[PDB]
Sequence to fold (70 residues):
Amino acid sequence: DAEEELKEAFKVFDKDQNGYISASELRHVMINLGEKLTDEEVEQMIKEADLDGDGQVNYEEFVKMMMTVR
Ligand SMILES: [Ca+2]
Ligand SMILES: [Ca+2]
Fold:
C-alpha cells in the first residue's frame, strides 16, 4: 500500500502530470498544507532533494526526501 498511497499523492502533486514534480507544484502543496517557507528554503529543498541535479524532483527523490523528513 505504501507504493500506492505514495504513488497517489505523487499523482496529486504532479499537477502537470508530467511524471515529475516541479518546484511550483511543491510550493502550491506547501500552501495547501498551510506551510510557507522562504524561496531560499524551497529552492534548497529542490536542489537538496534532487539527486540528478535535473532541477526536477522525481518520484525516487520525493520518496527519498519524504523518507528523510517523514
Ligand atoms: Ca509536474
Ligand atoms: Ca530528479
Helices lie at 2-13, 23-32, 39-49, 59-69. The CA atoms of residues 12 and 63 lie 14 Å apart. The pocket of calcium ion (ligand 2) is lined by residues 50, 52, 54, 56, 58, 61 (CB under 6 Å).
